[PDB]
Design a protein around this ligand. Sequence first.
Ligand SMILES: COC(=O)c1ccc(O)cc1O
Ligand SMILES: COC(=O)c1ccc(O)cc1O
Ligand SMILES: Nc1nc2ccccc2[nH]1
Lengths: 188, 185
Amino acid sequence: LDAVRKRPGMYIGDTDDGTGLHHMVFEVVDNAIDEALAGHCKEIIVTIHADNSVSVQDDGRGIPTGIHPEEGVSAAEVIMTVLGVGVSVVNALSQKLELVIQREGKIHRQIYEHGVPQAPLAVTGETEKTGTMVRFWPSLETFTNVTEFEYEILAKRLRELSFLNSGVSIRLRDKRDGKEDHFHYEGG
Amino acid sequence: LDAVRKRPGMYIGDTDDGTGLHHMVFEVVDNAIDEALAGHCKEIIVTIHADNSVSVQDDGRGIPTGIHPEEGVSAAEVIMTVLGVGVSVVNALSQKLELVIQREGKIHRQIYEHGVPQAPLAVTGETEKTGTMVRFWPSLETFTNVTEFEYEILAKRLRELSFLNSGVSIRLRDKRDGKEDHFHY
Ligand SMILES: COC(=O)c1ccc(O)cc1O
Ligand SMILES: COC(=O)c1ccc(O)cc1O
Ligand SMILES: Nc1nc2ccccc2[nH]1
Protein backbone atom coordinates (compact mmCIF):
# COMPACT_ATOMS: atom_id res chain seq x y z
CA LEU A 1 0.00 0.00 0.00
CA ASP A 2 2.97 2.38 0.05
CA ALA A 3 2.23 3.46 -3.53
CA VAL A 4 -1.12 4.73 -2.29
CA ARG A 5 0.33 6.44 0.75
CA LYS A 6 2.96 8.22 -1.39
CA ARG A 7 0.36 9.81 -3.73
CA PRO A 8 -3.13 9.38 -2.23
CA GLY A 9 -4.64 11.87 -4.68
CA MET A 10 -3.85 9.60 -7.64
CA TYR A 11 -6.01 6.89 -5.97
CA ILE A 12 -8.85 8.59 -4.06
CA GLY A 13 -9.10 12.03 -5.73
CA ASP A 14 -8.78 15.50 -4.21
CA THR A 15 -7.82 15.20 -0.58
CA ASP A 16 -8.50 18.84 0.23
CA ASP A 17 -11.96 19.69 -1.11
CA GLY A 18 -14.04 16.90 0.35
CA THR A 19 -14.47 14.94 -2.87
CA GLY A 20 -11.92 12.28 -2.02
CA LEU A 21 -13.22 12.09 1.52
CA HIS A 22 -16.69 11.19 0.34
CA HIS A 23 -15.23 8.85 -2.27
CA MET A 24 -13.93 6.77 0.66
CA VAL A 25 -17.55 6.09 1.61
CA PHE A 26 -18.69 5.40 -1.92
CA GLU A 27 -15.99 2.84 -2.50
CA VAL A 28 -16.99 0.98 0.64
CA VAL A 29 -20.65 1.21 -0.34
CA ASP A 30 -19.88 -0.25 -3.80
CA ASN A 31 -18.36 -3.35 -2.17
CA ALA A 32 -21.28 -3.64 0.27
CA ILE A 33 -23.81 -3.46 -2.56
CA ASP A 34 -21.96 -6.25 -4.38
CA GLU A 35 -22.14 -8.32 -1.16
CA ALA A 36 -25.82 -7.53 -0.60
CA LEU A 37 -26.74 -8.46 -4.22
CA ALA A 38 -25.43 -11.99 -3.80
CA GLY A 39 -28.15 -12.67 -1.19
CA HIS A 40 -31.94 -12.65 -0.96
CA CYS A 41 -32.75 -10.09 1.79
CA LYS A 42 -30.17 -7.54 0.63
CA GLU A 43 -29.75 -4.72 3.14
CA ILE A 44 -26.92 -2.33 3.74
CA ILE A 45 -26.79 0.25 6.48
CA VAL A 46 -24.58 3.32 6.19
CA THR A 47 -24.04 5.16 9.46
CA ILE A 48 -22.28 8.45 10.08
CA HIS A 49 -20.99 8.19 13.58
CA ALA A 50 -20.51 11.03 15.98
CA ASP A 51 -16.74 10.58 16.04
CA ASN A 52 -16.44 11.39 12.35
CA SER A 53 -16.24 7.74 11.24
CA VAL A 54 -18.61 5.97 8.82
CA SER A 55 -19.67 2.34 9.00
CA VAL A 56 -21.21 0.23 6.26
CA GLN A 57 -22.86 -3.07 7.08
CA ASP A 58 -24.32 -5.65 4.75
CA ASP A 59 -26.15 -8.87 5.34
CA GLY A 60 -24.32 -10.76 2.62
CA ARG A 61 -22.25 -13.92 2.88
CA GLY A 62 -19.35 -12.34 4.71
CA ILE A 63 -15.96 -11.68 3.12
CA PRO A 64 -13.95 -14.96 2.96
CA THR A 65 -11.89 -15.56 6.09
CA GLY A 66 -9.70 -18.58 5.36
CA ILE A 67 -5.95 -18.22 5.12
CA HIS A 68 -4.80 -17.45 1.59
CA PRO A 69 -2.38 -20.27 0.69
CA GLU A 70 0.14 -17.96 -0.90
CA GLU A 71 -0.16 -14.74 1.10
CA GLY A 72 -0.24 -16.61 4.41
CA VAL A 73 -2.91 -14.42 6.01
CA SER A 74 -6.69 -14.38 5.96
CA ALA A 75 -8.31 -13.72 2.58
CA ALA A 76 -9.99 -10.71 4.21
CA GLU A 77 -6.59 -9.27 5.15
CA VAL A 78 -5.33 -9.79 1.59
CA ILE A 79 -8.30 -7.83 0.26
CA MET A 80 -7.63 -5.03 2.77
CA THR A 81 -3.86 -4.78 2.22
CA VAL A 82 -3.12 -5.60 -1.42
CA LEU A 83 -3.58 -3.12 -4.22
CA GLY A 84 -13.50 0.93 -8.30
CA VAL A 85 -10.21 1.63 -6.56
CA GLY A 86 -10.53 -1.23 -4.06
CA VAL A 87 -11.18 -1.12 -0.33
CA SER A 88 -7.40 -1.41 0.24
CA VAL A 89 -7.10 2.27 -0.79
CA VAL A 90 -9.69 3.20 1.79
CA ASN A 91 -7.87 1.16 4.44
CA ALA A 92 -4.51 2.78 3.52
CA LEU A 93 -5.96 6.27 3.92
CA SER A 94 -7.82 5.52 7.16
CA GLN A 95 -6.25 6.23 10.53
CA LYS A 96 -8.38 3.38 11.80
CA LEU A 97 -10.51 0.70 10.18
CA GLU A 98 -12.59 -1.89 12.01
CA LEU A 99 -13.62 -5.07 10.23
CA VAL A 100 -16.30 -7.48 11.47
CA ILE A 101 -17.25 -10.51 9.38
CA GLN A 102 -20.08 -12.90 10.31
CA ARG A 103 -19.68 -16.15 8.45
CA GLU A 104 -20.09 -19.89 9.06
CA GLY A 105 -21.53 -19.26 12.49
CA LYS A 106 -18.52 -17.21 13.60
CA ILE A 107 -17.80 -13.54 14.32
CA HIS A 108 -14.38 -12.45 12.98
CA ARG A 109 -12.80 -9.11 13.97
CA GLN A 110 -9.77 -7.16 12.96
CA ILE A 111 -8.47 -3.62 13.41
CA TYR A 112 -6.22 -1.68 11.06
CA GLU A 113 -4.45 1.62 11.60
CA HIS A 114 -3.21 3.41 8.44
CA GLY A 115 -3.70 0.11 6.63
CA VAL A 116 -1.55 -1.88 9.05
CA PRO A 117 -3.37 -4.77 10.73
CA GLN A 118 -3.03 -4.63 14.53
CA ALA A 119 -3.46 -8.39 14.86
CA PRO A 120 -4.52 -11.24 12.62
CA LEU A 121 -8.17 -11.76 11.85
CA ALA A 122 -9.60 -13.45 14.97
CA VAL A 123 -12.71 -15.53 15.68
CA THR A 124 -14.09 -13.82 18.75
CA GLY A 125 -17.53 -15.40 18.94
CA GLU A 126 -20.61 -17.02 17.51
CA THR A 127 -23.49 -15.75 15.41
CA GLU A 128 -26.47 -16.97 13.45
CA LYS A 129 -26.17 -14.06 11.03
CA THR A 130 -23.96 -13.42 8.06
CA GLY A 131 -22.42 -10.22 6.66
CA THR A 132 -19.58 -7.75 6.61
CA MET A 133 -19.19 -4.50 8.50
CA VAL A 134 -16.43 -1.93 7.78
CA ARG A 135 -16.09 1.18 9.86
CA PHE A 136 -13.41 3.65 9.00
CA TRP A 137 -11.94 6.82 10.40
CA PRO A 138 -10.39 8.86 7.56
CA SER A 139 -6.80 9.80 8.12
CA LEU A 140 -6.53 13.45 9.08
CA GLU A 141 -2.89 13.31 7.94
CA THR A 142 -4.31 12.77 4.44
CA PHE A 143 -7.71 14.51 4.42
CA THR A 144 -7.29 18.21 5.01
CA ASN A 145 -9.62 21.20 5.00
CA VAL A 146 -12.90 19.30 4.53
CA THR A 147 -12.84 16.48 7.09
CA GLU A 148 -16.46 15.90 8.07
CA PHE A 149 -19.01 13.90 6.14
CA GLU A 150 -21.93 15.79 4.62
CA TYR A 151 -25.18 13.80 5.03
CA GLU A 152 -26.72 15.26 1.86
CA ILE A 153 -23.82 14.10 -0.30
CA LEU A 154 -24.31 10.53 0.89
CA ALA A 155 -28.13 10.64 0.69
CA LYS A 156 -28.25 12.00 -2.86
CA ARG A 157 -25.91 9.34 -4.14
CA LEU A 158 -27.41 6.46 -2.12
CA ARG A 159 -30.79 7.44 -3.57
CA GLU A 160 -29.39 7.29 -7.12
CA LEU A 161 -27.80 3.93 -6.32
CA SER A 162 -31.05 2.40 -5.09
CA PHE A 163 -32.65 2.64 -8.55
CA LEU A 164 -29.76 0.67 -10.17
CA ASN A 165 -29.79 -1.99 -7.52
CA SER A 166 -33.15 -3.65 -7.45
CA GLY A 167 -34.22 -5.22 -4.26
CA VAL A 168 -31.42 -3.78 -2.20
CA SER A 169 -32.53 -1.94 0.91
CA ILE A 170 -30.21 0.95 1.75
CA ARG A 171 -30.52 2.62 5.16
CA LEU A 172 -28.65 5.81 6.04
CA ARG A 173 -28.38 7.07 9.64
CA ASP A 174 -26.62 10.16 10.92
CA LYS A 175 -25.81 9.73 14.61
CA ARG A 176 -24.76 13.37 14.88
CA ASP A 177 -28.38 14.64 14.64
CA GLY A 178 -30.58 11.50 14.41
CA LYS A 179 -31.47 12.08 10.75
CA GLU A 180 -32.27 8.90 8.80
CA ASP A 181 -33.38 7.73 5.37
CA HIS A 182 -34.40 4.57 3.66
CA PHE A 183 -33.87 3.94 -0.02
CA HIS A 184 -35.39 0.77 -1.31
CA TYR A 185 -36.33 0.30 -4.96
CA GLU A 186 -38.06 -2.95 -5.75
CA GLY A 187 -38.29 -2.69 -9.50
CA GLY A 188 -37.52 -5.55 -11.78
CA LEU B 1 7.62 -1.65 4.34
CA ASP B 2 4.21 -2.98 5.49
CA ALA B 3 5.76 -6.28 6.62
CA VAL B 4 7.87 -4.27 9.03
CA ARG B 5 5.07 -2.09 10.26
CA LYS B 6 2.92 -5.17 10.86
CA ARG B 7 5.48 -6.91 13.14
CA PRO B 8 8.02 -4.29 14.19
CA GLY B 9 9.34 -6.47 17.06
CA MET B 10 10.47 -9.12 14.57
CA TYR B 11 12.64 -6.66 12.74
CA ILE B 12 13.99 -4.28 15.34
CA GLY B 13 13.61 -6.01 18.66
CA ASP B 14 11.33 -5.54 21.64
CA THR B 15 9.26 -2.44 21.24
CA ASP B 16 8.31 -2.15 24.88
CA ASP B 17 11.51 -2.49 26.88
CA GLY B 18 13.83 -0.03 25.16
CA THR B 19 15.62 -2.70 23.21
CA GLY B 20 14.16 -1.94 19.81
CA LEU B 21 14.25 1.75 20.42
CA HIS B 22 18.04 1.75 20.84
CA HIS B 23 18.50 -0.74 18.05
CA MET B 24 17.05 1.92 15.73
CA VAL B 25 20.07 4.09 16.52
CA PHE B 26 22.47 1.21 16.12
CA GLU B 27 21.23 0.37 12.64
CA VAL B 28 21.73 3.91 11.43
CA VAL B 29 25.14 4.04 13.03
CA ASP B 30 26.24 0.87 11.20
CA ASN B 31 25.52 2.51 7.90
CA ALA B 32 27.24 5.67 9.04
CA ILE B 33 30.37 3.83 10.07
CA ASP B 34 30.59 2.15 6.72
CA GLU B 35 30.29 5.56 5.03
CA ALA B 36 32.88 7.11 7.26
CA LEU B 37 35.35 4.36 6.52
CA ALA B 38 35.30 5.03 2.85
CA GLY B 39 36.11 8.66 3.38
CA HIS B 40 39.08 10.71 4.44
CA CYS B 41 38.33 12.25 7.78
CA LYS B 42 36.39 9.36 9.21
CA GLU B 43 34.10 10.89 11.78
CA ILE B 44 30.50 10.25 12.75
CA ILE B 45 28.46 12.32 15.19
CA VAL B 46 25.52 10.84 17.09
CA THR B 47 23.24 13.40 18.72
CA ILE B 48 20.32 12.88 21.07
CA HIS B 49 18.13 15.87 20.52
CA ALA B 50 15.90 17.49 23.08
CA ASP B 51 12.78 16.44 21.19
CA ASN B 52 13.51 12.69 21.61
CA SER B 53 15.02 12.27 18.15
CA VAL B 54 18.52 11.09 17.22
CA SER B 55 20.70 12.29 14.33
CA VAL B 56 23.71 10.51 12.89
CA GLN B 57 26.10 12.37 10.65
CA ASP B 58 29.11 11.13 8.73
CA ASP B 59 31.73 12.84 6.62
CA GLY B 60 31.68 10.14 4.02
CA ARG B 61 31.14 10.40 0.28
CA GLY B 62 27.41 10.83 0.51
CA ILE B 63 24.98 8.13 -0.40
CA PRO B 64 24.21 7.90 -4.14
CA THR B 65 21.50 10.24 -5.29
CA GLY B 66 20.95 9.15 -8.87
CA ILE B 67 17.82 7.54 -10.13
CA HIS B 68 17.83 3.81 -9.67
CA PRO B 69 17.44 2.38 -13.19
CA GLU B 70 14.99 -0.21 -12.11
CA GLU B 71 13.00 1.38 -9.31
CA GLY B 72 12.59 4.69 -10.96
CA VAL B 73 13.34 6.81 -7.90
CA SER B 74 16.54 8.05 -6.26
CA ALA B 75 18.93 5.33 -5.06
CA ALA B 76 18.69 6.92 -1.63
CA GLU B 77 14.91 6.45 -1.62
CA VAL B 78 15.36 2.83 -2.70
CA ILE B 79 17.58 2.26 0.32
CA MET B 80 15.08 4.00 2.62
CA THR B 81 12.04 2.14 1.36
CA VAL B 82 13.00 -1.35 0.20
CA LEU B 83 13.85 -4.18 2.54
CA GLY B 84 22.04 -5.92 9.66
CA VAL B 85 18.30 -5.18 9.14
CA GLY B 86 18.68 -2.10 6.88
CA VAL B 87 17.86 1.55 7.43
CA SER B 88 14.48 0.98 5.71
CA VAL B 89 13.33 -0.67 8.98
CA VAL B 90 14.25 2.43 10.94
CA ASN B 91 12.45 4.59 8.38
CA ALA B 92 9.30 2.43 8.54
CA LEU B 93 9.20 2.74 12.35
CA SER B 94 9.93 6.44 12.52
CA GLN B 95 7.12 8.95 12.64
CA LYS B 96 9.53 11.31 10.84
CA LEU B 97 12.95 10.89 9.19
CA GLU B 98 15.04 13.63 7.64
CA LEU B 99 17.74 12.74 5.16
CA VAL B 100 20.47 15.17 4.09
CA ILE B 101 23.11 14.05 1.55
CA GLN B 102 26.08 16.23 0.57
CA ARG B 103 27.55 14.88 -2.61
CA GLU B 104 29.14 16.07 -5.85
CA GLY B 105 28.91 19.74 -4.87
CA LYS B 106 25.21 19.67 -3.89
CA ILE B 107 23.00 19.32 -0.80
CA HIS B 108 20.06 16.99 -1.22
CA ARG B 109 17.14 16.70 1.22
CA GLN B 110 14.18 14.43 1.78
CA ILE B 111 11.60 13.92 4.47
CA TYR B 112 9.77 10.73 5.33
CA GLU B 113 6.82 10.17 7.68
CA HIS B 114 6.27 6.59 8.81
CA GLY B 115 8.46 5.49 5.90
CA VAL B 116 6.54 7.44 3.28
CA PRO B 117 8.50 10.05 1.32
CA GLN B 118 6.92 13.46 1.44
CA ALA B 119 8.55 14.43 -1.84
CA PRO B 120 11.31 13.15 -4.10
CA LEU B 121 14.93 13.66 -3.11
CA ALA B 122 15.69 17.20 -4.02
CA VAL B 123 18.73 19.39 -4.53
CA THR B 124 18.46 22.33 -2.13
CA GLY B 125 21.83 24.10 -2.39
CA GLU B 126 25.54 23.85 -3.01
CA THR B 127 28.33 22.66 -0.76
CA GLU B 128 31.98 21.84 -0.66
CA LYS B 129 31.40 19.11 1.93
CA THR B 130 30.46 15.45 1.57
CA GLY B 131 28.49 13.23 3.90
CA THR B 132 25.16 11.86 4.95
CA MET B 133 22.93 12.86 7.85
CA VAL B 134 19.86 10.97 9.04
CA ARG B 135 17.69 12.30 11.87
CA PHE B 136 14.79 10.15 13.00
CA TRP B 137 11.91 10.51 15.44
CA PRO B 138 10.82 7.03 16.57
CA SER B 139 7.15 6.30 16.15
CA LEU B 140 5.40 6.51 19.52
CA GLU B 141 2.74 4.32 17.90
CA THR B 142 5.31 1.52 17.83
CA PHE B 143 7.61 2.20 20.81
CA THR B 144 5.85 2.08 24.17
CA ASN B 145 6.93 2.28 27.86
CA VAL B 146 10.58 3.12 27.19
CA THR B 147 10.36 5.97 24.71
CA GLU B 148 13.30 8.17 25.66
CA PHE B 149 16.87 7.39 24.63
CA GLU B 150 19.20 6.35 27.41
CA TYR B 151 22.60 7.99 26.91
CA GLU B 152 24.54 5.15 28.59
CA ILE B 153 23.00 2.47 26.38
CA LEU B 154 24.26 4.39 23.32
CA ALA B 155 27.64 5.12 24.88
CA LYS B 156 28.37 1.52 25.70
CA ARG B 157 27.71 0.34 22.16
CA LEU B 158 29.56 3.20 20.47
CA ARG B 159 32.57 2.42 22.68
CA GLU B 160 32.53 -1.21 21.52
CA LEU B 161 32.28 -0.09 17.92
CA SER B 162 35.20 2.37 18.21
CA PHE B 163 37.57 -0.52 19.01
CA LEU B 164 36.30 -2.54 16.15
CA ASN B 165 36.42 0.31 13.70
CA SER B 166 39.73 1.78 14.58
CA GLY B 167 40.58 5.02 13.00
CA VAL B 168 36.98 6.17 12.95
CA SER B 169 36.12 8.98 15.27
CA ILE B 170 32.76 8.68 17.07
CA ARG B 171 31.28 11.62 18.90
CA LEU B 172 28.20 11.32 21.08
CA ARG B 173 26.26 14.41 22.28
CA ASP B 174 23.18 14.64 24.47
CA LYS B 175 21.48 17.99 23.93
CA ARG B 176 19.07 17.34 26.81
CA ASP B 177 21.73 17.79 29.50
CA GLY B 178 24.96 18.72 27.62
CA LYS B 179 26.63 15.34 28.20
CA GLU B 180 29.19 14.23 25.62
CA ASP B 181 31.79 11.61 24.73
CA HIS B 182 34.36 10.90 22.13
CA PHE B 183 35.26 7.40 21.15
CA HIS B 184 38.37 7.08 19.04
CA TYR B 185 40.65 4.03 18.87
C1 LIG C 1 -14.56 -6.52 -0.32
O1 LIG C 1 -15.57 -6.22 0.69
C2 LIG C 1 -15.52 -5.02 1.27
O2 LIG C 1 -14.57 -4.26 1.17
C3 LIG C 1 -16.78 -4.71 2.00
C4 LIG C 1 -17.84 -5.61 1.99
C5 LIG C 1 -19.01 -5.33 2.66
C6 LIG C 1 -19.15 -4.14 3.35
O3 LIG C 1 -20.32 -3.93 4.03
C7 LIG C 1 -18.12 -3.21 3.36
C8 LIG C 1 -16.94 -3.49 2.68
O4 LIG C 1 -15.97 -2.54 2.67
C1 LIG D 1 22.31 4.03 3.46
O1 LIG D 1 23.02 4.77 4.48
C2 LIG D 1 22.30 5.17 5.55
O2 LIG D 1 21.23 4.71 5.86
C3 LIG D 1 23.05 6.19 6.35
C4 LIG D 1 22.55 6.72 7.54
C5 LIG D 1 23.30 7.62 8.30
C6 LIG D 1 24.57 8.00 7.87
O3 LIG D 1 25.30 8.93 8.57
C7 LIG D 1 25.09 7.47 6.70
C8 LIG D 1 24.33 6.57 5.94
O4 LIG D 1 24.85 6.09 4.79
N1 LIG E 1 0.27 8.11 12.19
C1 LIG E 1 0.59 7.30 11.19
N2 LIG E 1 0.61 7.65 9.89
C2 LIG E 1 1.01 6.49 9.23
C3 LIG E 1 1.22 6.26 7.87
C4 LIG E 1 1.62 4.99 7.46
C5 LIG E 1 1.78 3.97 8.39
C6 LIG E 1 1.59 4.19 9.74
C7 LIG E 1 1.21 5.46 10.14
N3 LIG E 1 0.94 6.00 11.38
